[PDB]
Design a protein around this ligand. Structure first.
Ligand SMILES: [Zn+2]
Ligand SMILES: [Zn+2]
Ligand SMILES: [Zn+2]
Ligand SMILES: [Zn+2]
Ligand SMILES: [Zn+2]
Ligand SMILES: [Zn+2]
Ligand SMILES: [Zn+2]
Ligand SMILES: [Zn+2]
Ligand SMILES: [Zn+2]
Ligand SMILES: [Zn+2]
Ligand SMILES: [Zn+2]
Ligand SMILES: [Zn+2]
Ligand SMILES: [Zn+2]
Ligand SMILES: [Zn+2]
Ligand SMILES: [Zn+2]
Ligand SMILES: [Zn+2]
Ligand SMILES: [Zn+2]
Ligand SMILES: [Zn+2]
Lengths: 111, 111, 112, 112
């Protein structure tokens, strides 16, 4: 499977479990949803890509982090966190982690 | 003006100049553009809000960093960088910096 | 500006980290010599961390005493303190070293 | 899973930083004390950085020799090297310290 994401809560140093994440493909107009899943107990979704071959182009994962903090009775600057990325080789592995705090985050292409 | 953004290029330790940044307002499960501007020689847009009172709700600034890198013949993982945030109080200041590399970034509410 | 500014933004509150002790040291042979110590102000800033002596080129270290900052709030942190080592290759320039801070994560960089 | 792992991701390439020297030191009574040194593999990893000797609680630091890493590519960096200090309260636990590296900025955290 060509896409994995995970969330590490930088305030606890522990994974953010049970966080909804969506995957969309950029279309000519707007976006098209490909999948949705929730991070597991290790804050991971190891296989977020649906059962379909990928094409080169732009994609967007959206980590629903607002809800995750809301459940802890915590406020956050971000209602959710979209990350847009480009696939240029269709059978490569893509890894998009999120390092999360209430009022800041980091994301990168992981190994 | 209630919204400032700036971009620091972590690969040079210098500001990212002449980068286009849009501002959108959330409305009916879609987004509406309110303004667009370019970071100055210091990587800043001091006054990104249009000349109209802000309303509470969710907003999205989109840093056009894919284009910034492509002009330098540098590949980037991200075609652009959207950041969504809540504006709960219409008259206070919102500062949304971006720390930028080709394959990673950080954003946060600034002071 | 002063040759050296530092500030701390608490990423968990989205507000500056006030009253955090920060030291400045110069590399001296295989060790370090303290040049100054100061505390972030109410905006999380130390606008002028260099003491009133001429800065020389070479390597330096700021240590953000963040373990203590979190301990006062009865919060645990992975880092007892956070050292950042950097170059001062040119004494005619301004050096800005921000710290973006969480209990189990941080970022630092050369700012403007 | 080892008491201590570290890895480096070069955020300018989106690829691991290979063959980077990393030391590990303990905060002993007589000063900082080297316990081990190693080099990241082709995946940017040192999965087992602890020496064979039993770990105790206390303060430790890893120093990623990134200055050298960039100098081999004829690239400048703000940091001669990057120290990261951290607490080990439970010797039975796994401690992971990734470094996300750019020439003029980095991020670190306690990983899973
Ligand atoms: Zn992962
Ligand atoms: Zn959204
Ligand atoms: Zn693309
Ligand atoms: Zn992966
Ligand atoms: Zn992979
Ligand atoms: Zn700014
Ligand atoms: Zn977009
Ligand atoms: Zn909102
Ligand atoms: Zn501001
Ligand atoms: Zn402000
Ligand atoms: Zn500052
Ligand atoms: Zn120290
Ligand atoms: Zn130097
Ligand atoms: Zn400055
Ligand atoms: Zn690792
Ligand atoms: Zn050192
Ligand atoms: Zn300790
Ligand atoms: Zn690990």
């Amino acid at each position: 499977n060509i896409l994995s994401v995970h969330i590490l809560n930088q305030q606890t140093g522990k994974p953010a479990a049970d966080v909804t994440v969506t995957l969309e493909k950029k279309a000519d107009n707007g976006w098209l949803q490909l999948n949705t899943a929730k991070t597991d107990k290790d804050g991971r979704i190891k296989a977020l890509w649906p059962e379909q071959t990928a094409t080169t182009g732009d994609y967007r994962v959206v980590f629903k982090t607002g809800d995750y903090f809301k459940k802890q009775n915590l406020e956050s600057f971000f209602p959710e966190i979209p990350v847009e990325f480009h696939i240029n080789k269709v059978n490569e592995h893509y890894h998009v982690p999120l390092l999360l705090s209430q009022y800041g985050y980091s994301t990168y292409r992981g190994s």
